[PDB]
Amino acid sequence: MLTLKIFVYTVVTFFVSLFIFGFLSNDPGRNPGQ
Amino acid sequence: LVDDRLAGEGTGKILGINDPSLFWAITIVFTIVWGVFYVSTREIDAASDRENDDDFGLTL
Amino acid sequence: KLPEAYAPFDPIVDVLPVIPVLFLLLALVWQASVSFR
Amino acid sequence: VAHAGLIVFWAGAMNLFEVAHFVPEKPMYEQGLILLPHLATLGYGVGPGGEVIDTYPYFVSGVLHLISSAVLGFGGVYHSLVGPETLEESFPFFGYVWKDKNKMTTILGIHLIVLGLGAWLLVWKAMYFGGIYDTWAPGGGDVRIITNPTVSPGVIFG
Amino acid sequence: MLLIFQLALFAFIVVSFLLVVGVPVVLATPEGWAENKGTVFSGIGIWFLLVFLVGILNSFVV
Amino acid sequence: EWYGPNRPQFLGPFSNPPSYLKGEFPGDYGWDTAGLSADPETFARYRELEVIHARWAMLGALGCVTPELLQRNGVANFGEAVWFKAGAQIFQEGGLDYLGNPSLIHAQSIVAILLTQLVLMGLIEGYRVNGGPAGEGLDALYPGEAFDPLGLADDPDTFAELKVKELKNGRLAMVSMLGFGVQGLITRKGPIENLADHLAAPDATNFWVDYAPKSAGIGY
Amino acid sequence: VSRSGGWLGSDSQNINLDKWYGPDRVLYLPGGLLARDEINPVLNGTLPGDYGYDPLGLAKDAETLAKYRANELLHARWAMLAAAGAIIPEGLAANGADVKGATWFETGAAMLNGGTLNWFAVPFVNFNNPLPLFAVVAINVALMAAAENYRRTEDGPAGYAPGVGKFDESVYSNMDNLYPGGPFDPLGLADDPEVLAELKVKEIKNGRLAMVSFLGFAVQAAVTGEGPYANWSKHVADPFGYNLLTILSSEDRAAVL
Numbered sequence: 160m161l162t163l164k165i166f167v168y169t170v171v172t173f174f175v176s177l178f179i180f181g182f183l184s185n186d187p188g189r190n191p192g193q
Numbered sequence: 194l195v196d197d198r199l200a201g202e203g204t205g206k207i208l209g210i211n212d213p214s215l216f217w218a219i220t221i222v223f224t225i226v227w228g229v230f231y232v233s234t235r236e237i238d239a240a241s242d243r244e245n246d247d248d249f250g251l252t253l
Numbered sequence: 254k255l256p257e258a259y260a261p262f263d264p265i266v267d268v269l270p271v272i273p274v275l276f277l278l279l280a281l282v283w284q285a286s287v288s289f290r
Numbered sequence: 291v292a293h294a295g296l297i298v299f300w301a302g303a304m305n306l307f308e309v310a311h312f313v314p315e316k317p318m319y320e321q322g323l324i325l326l327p328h329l330a331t332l333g334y335g336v337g338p339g340g341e342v343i344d345t346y347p348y349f350v351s352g353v354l355h356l357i358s359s360a361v362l363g364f365g366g367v368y369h370s371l372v373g374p375e376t377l378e379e380s381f382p383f384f385g386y387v388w389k390d391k392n393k394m395t396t397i398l399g400i401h402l403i404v405l406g407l408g409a410w411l412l413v414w415k416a417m418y419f420g421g422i423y424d425t426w427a428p429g430g431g432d433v434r435i436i437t438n439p440t441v442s443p444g445v446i447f448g
Numbered sequence: 449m450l451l452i453f454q455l456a457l458f459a460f461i462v463v464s465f466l467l468v469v470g471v472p473v474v475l476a477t478p479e480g481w482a483e484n485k486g487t488v489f490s491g492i493g494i495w496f497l498l499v500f501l502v503g504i505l506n507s508f509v510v
Numbered sequence: 511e512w513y514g515p516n517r518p519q520f521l522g523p524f525s526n527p528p529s530y531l532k533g534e535f536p537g538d539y540g541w542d543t544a545g546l547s548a549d550p551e552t553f554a555r556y557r558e559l560e561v562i563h564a565r566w567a568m569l570g571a572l573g574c575v576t577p578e579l580l581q582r583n584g585v586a587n588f589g590e591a592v593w594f595k596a597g598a599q600i601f602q603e604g605g606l607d608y609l610g611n612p613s614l615i616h617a618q619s620i621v622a623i624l625l626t627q628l629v630l631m632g633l634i635e636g637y638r639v640n641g642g643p644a645g646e647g648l649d650a651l652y653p654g655e656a657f658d659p660l661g662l663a664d665d666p667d668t669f670a671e672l673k674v675k676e677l678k679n680g681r682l683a684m685v686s687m688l689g690f691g692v693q694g695l696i697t698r699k700g701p702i703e704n705l706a707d708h709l710a711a712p713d714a715t716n717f718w719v720d721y722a723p724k725s726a727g728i729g730y
Numbered sequence: 731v732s733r734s735g736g737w738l739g740s741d742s743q744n745i746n747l748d749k750w751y752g753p754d755r756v757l758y759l760p761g762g763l764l765a766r767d768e769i770n771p772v773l774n775g776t777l778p779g780d781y782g783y784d785p786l787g788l789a790k791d792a793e794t795l796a797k798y799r800a801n802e803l804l805h806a807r808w809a810m811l812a813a814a815g816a817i818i819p820e821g822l823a824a825n826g827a828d829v830k831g832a833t834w835f836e837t838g839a840a841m842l843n844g845g846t847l848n849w850f851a852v853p854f855v856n857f858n859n860p861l862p863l864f865a866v867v868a869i870n871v872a873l874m875a876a877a878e879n880y881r882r883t884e885d886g887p888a889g890y891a892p893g894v895g896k897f898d899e900s901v902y903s904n905m906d907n908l909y910p911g912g913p914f915d916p917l918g919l920a921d922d923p924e925v926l927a928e929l930k931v932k933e934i935k936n937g938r939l940a941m942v943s944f945l946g947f948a949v950q951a952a953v954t955g956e957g958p959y960a961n962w963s964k965h966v967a968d969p970f971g972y973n974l975l976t977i978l979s980s981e982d983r984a985a986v987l
């Protein structure tokens with residue numbers, strides 16, 4: 160059961176870190192504005 | 194008892210971490226993603242053809 | 254209850270809290286009088 | 291400023307309305323009061339066991355709030371009607387531009403300092419100015435004085 | 449002393465009502481704020497004096 | 511004297527000053543046997559270090575002898591009169607009271623003392639090395655002006671004489687402070703107590719007889 | 731080379747005299763409540779501390795303004811000294827020191843029959859001043875009379891002061907009636923016109939604050955009946971339980987409901 164907890168924690172933190180560091184990567188500049 | 198269980202419900206642990214293994218998993222994954230993101234920030238900023246001075250950003 | 258010295262002014266207290274709603278209505282009335290320019 | 295005056299006006303008027311409709315033969319929660327229990331938890335006009343003993347502090351709080359609301363409302367009306375329209379040329383200290391990051395950060399810091407002072411003002415009440423109502427006090431709930439607050443990082447982070 | 453305190457409170461109420469109805473009218477007229485400043489200043493001073501007097505007199509009636 | 515080729519030397523009649531010690535600065539007795547001041551820049555830095563150390567040592571020696579003397583004479587009463595135990599009074603129940611009465615300082619926290627000293631001393635030392643309220647372009651070591659209220663050093667010759675006297679007194683203070691430290695370390699007693707014990711029985715109370723035989727294989 | 735500088739590093743003085751002198755100086759009312767044309771023409775922003783506050787037309791011309799400024803400066807300095815010496819000994823004695831007649835409105839009564847006034851040379855030694863009442867009054871009267879006669883004469887004897895040095899009876903020539911300087915300024919802080927002007931403004935503001943403070947001291951002594959330090963200590967201990975309104979109520983108030 161602890162192995163499942165470790166695996167789920169790893170997956171969740173991976174996806175949340177992807178979300179955070181993607182929204183930090185100059186997102187308000189990816190628009191078709193002139 | 195008859196069986197065994199984690200027995201962590203309703204305890205009040207910080208971030209639910211009852212194990213240094215969980216702490217290490219969180220820290221290692223976060224650090225890996227941050228390190229991959231860190232080196233590309235100079236290239237990503239240069240895609241807007243502007244310098245990251247005090248006037249940078251989306252402003253109105 | 255209010256102190257004995259403030260008893261005659263009880264009716265004034267009973268109507269105070271509606272004044273903010275009256276203020277919103279007054280803003281609408283002012284806009285109407287200005288003719289919604 | 292006018293909106294802040296409106297908020298203070300509602301606070302004072304509602305406190306006066308609730309203090310004028312309060313009977314001592316019923317508990318606070320049985321009479322539809324929501325502002326009076328806030329002052330009771332601060333240790334104002336309450337006794338052992340949770341029985342209301344005095345009422346004058348509630349009246350004082352309401353009157354002070356109402357008069358301060360009058361002052362704030364006058365200030366807001368002045369600044370909205372006949373005050374300067376754009377205070378970036380006559381009052382450079384108070385003037386700002388939405389796109390000037392440094393000025394916005396400075397204003398944010400000033401208001402953070404003000405909020406921290408407010409939190410410390412709350413802290414001083416429970417220590418030196420009579421304390422606050424403690425419902426877990428030995429021998430029934432009563433207005434205690436907090437002498438040993440828990441400032442342990444493990445407790446706060448928990 | 450009670451009658452004096454009640455008279456002071458009534459005077460405070462009427463002065464507050466006069467200020468509430470008059471200050472926006474004075475401030476919202478063209479070239480009215482720049483001329484009728486003395487009346488508004490005297491009204492504000494009387495308001496403050498009345499509130500201080502009522503606060504002082506409250507200590508004897510309560 | 512005190513300057514030029516005819517100044518007194520650090521060995522007496524056996525005089526042999528180095529080539530870079532011409533006798534231009536106060537306290538120049540021609541003692542550089544290690545060649546540590548052959549570089550003029552290092553010489554200037556060493557001069558400033560020596561003067562500052564001298565002044566600090568004079569203040570420290572006076573502050574280490576005063577409260578213990580007052581307490582031993584019975585004039586005053588302190589929580590800890592000994593110089594190497596005065597810092598621990600802040601951990602006592604009554605706090606730190608100046609000269610014993612609770613109406614003078616009544617210090618209670620060590621963090622506040624640390625932070626206030628950090629801020630104040632940093633500001634005043636930055637003033638000293640850069641210039642502040644008391645001046646902007648004065649001398650590095652002898653600024654004068656606001657720090658010489660009652661002018662004692664105005665004639666150039668009296669200025670040099672006072673420089674020499676200050677340096678010699680400060681050097682004596684440095685030696686006394688080193689003695690204080692080492693000699694309270696060995697004996698675990700204050701300087702005044704050591705002086706009284708020696709003056710009681712000079713032959714019996716000393717360093718050699720008292721502690722030297724127990725300096726190898728035996729406890730002190 | 732300079733005799734003054736900034737307190738916060740290099741190039742950190744930034745003295746702004748246009749805020750306290752000239753046509754752009756700050757007045758006693760904000761710009762939206764009083765135009766600059768309503769100011770008395772005599773108050774043209776030349777003297778330090780000029781806030782343009784003269785409602786009851788008391789500054790007829792330059793001579794009256796100068797006389798009132800001299801009186802105000804003297805009163806402000808005396809108020810500084812009085813406030814300090816009336817607030818400090820009482821707190822010293824209340825914190826645990828041995829001071830007789832600490833309260834300011836009782837020191838005179840302390841030395842009435844045979845009482846003696848101990849002097850605390852903080853923080854070193856508490857003295858046992860043995861001067862009796864008659865000697866004290868004679869010495870104080872003599873010294874104050876001599877000093878004030880010297881002030882109005884615009885001349886003085888010969889002595890020695892730090893900084894200036896040994897001066898004869900001629901240094902008093904060309905000395906200002908209000909800012910004499912010289913022997914009275916040993917540290918030489920009054921050497922830069924900008925620093926001198928800002929110091930004058932600071933002095934006049936602190937003096938006005940001290941005057942208001944001592945008026946409050948006198949009124950508090952008349953009403954409450956104890957020393958100014960006791961009032962402050964009790965109010966800080968209990969803000970809502972010890973103030974003017976609480977003191978005024980001569981009897982306890984029955985509980986409201």
Ligand code: CHL
Pocket residue numbers: 558559562563566627628631632633635636639687688690691692
């Ligand atoms: C907190 C801010 C603060 C700042 C920014 C400075 C800044 C400065 N100080 Mg100052 N000081 C400050 C506080 C204090 N100073 C001093 C006392 C001195 C002295 C005596 C001297 C300076 C000097 C200097 C300059 C160079 C020092 C350096 O290179 O570090 C060196 C870094 C070290 C960590 C020093 C290590 C200590 C040293 C090797 C010996 C220590 C010996 C033991 C304590 C044993 C003694 C016990 C015996 C006596 C019983 C520099 C401008 C020096 C200067 O340049 O003079 C021209 C100088 O000589 N300062 C004291 C008294 C304790 C201070 C606070 O209390």
Ligand code: CLA
Pocket residue numbers: 291361362364365366368369373374377381384759760761762763
């Ligand atoms: C909320 C913040 C706020 C801010 C940032 C400003 C900002 C400004 N005001 Mg306005 N004002 C306010 C509220 C505010 N005001 C209120 C509540 C009133 C009613 C009294 C006024 C009445 C007012 C007047 C009459 C004038 C201005 C003018 C100005 C300018 C300052 C110059 C000056 O002399 O004013 C100083 C104004 C003061 C009221 C005196 C100082 C009072 C001290 C600072 C108060 C100490 C109280 C403390 C902060 C506790 C408050 C309780 C809090 C928890 C609510 C500047 C643009 C002036 C300008 O020139 O406009 C053309 C001017 O004419 N204001």
Ligand code: CLA
Pocket residue numbers: 808811812814815816818819829830831832833837847848849850851852859
């Ligand atoms: C407005 C003026 C003023 C007046 C009239 C008083 C009056 C008084 N004070 Mg207060 N005081 C004042 C301001 C004033 N004070 C200020 C500004 C402070 C410092 C913040 C104090 C601090 C203070 C203390 C600490 C004490 C008093 C006390 C008293 C009494 C004095 C008892 C005594 O023994 O003195 C004796 C005084 C002296 C012998 C005077 C010495 C002054 C020296 C000589 C300076 C002259 C300078 C000159 C250049 C020196 C050159 C010579 C050089 C070669 C050596 C008396 C009622 C005492 C008390 O018990 O009252 C309750 C006491 O304990 N006062």
Ligand SMILES: CCCCCCCCCCCCCCCCCC(=O)OC[C@H](CO[C@@H]1O[C@H](CO)[C@H](O)[C@H](O)[C@H]1O)OC(=O)CCCCCCCCCCCCCCCCC
Pocket residue numbers: 171175178179201202203204205206207208209210211
């Ligand atoms: C605080 C920094 C924020 C930075 C930016 C964050 C961006 C977030 C992006 C979206 C992510 C959403 C999904 C998150 C999934 C992981 C969390 C999870 O499932 O935890 C689930 C775990 C459950 O942990 C359980 O614990 C038990 C013992 O207590 C047992 O051990 C269980 O086995 C264990 O699973 O809970 C936590 O980890 C606690 C999280 C506490 C978070 C406190 C945040 C404080 C600061 C913010 C305050 C405001 C928060 C919002 C409030 C209002 C909301 C309407």
Ligand SMILES: CC1=C(/C=C/C(C)=C/C=C/C(C)=C/C=C/C=C(C)/C=C/C=C(C)/C=C/C2=C(C)CCCC2(C)C)C(C)(C)CCC1
Pocket residue numbers: 259262265266276277279280283292293295296299306353356357359360361362363364366367370460461464468502
């Ligand atoms: C600008 C504008 C606006 C707004 C405004 C506002 C928001 C205002 C406010 C205002 C205010 C906010 C005000 C206030 C006032 C107050 C007052 C005036 C008070 C008074 C009081 C009194 C008088 C009291 C009394 C008493 C006592 C003392 C005790 C007890 C009893 C009694 C209660 C009686 C609008 C929307 C219209 C729109 C347009 C623009």
Ligand SMILES: CC/C=C\C/C=C\C/C=C\CCCCCCCC(=O)O
Pocket residue numbers: 210211212213216
């Ligand atoms: C090179 C040294 C520098 C910095 C390192 C400093 C501190 C490291 C401290 C802790 C690391 C492990 C953290 C464990 C968190 C708690 C885990 C648990 O609750 O089981």
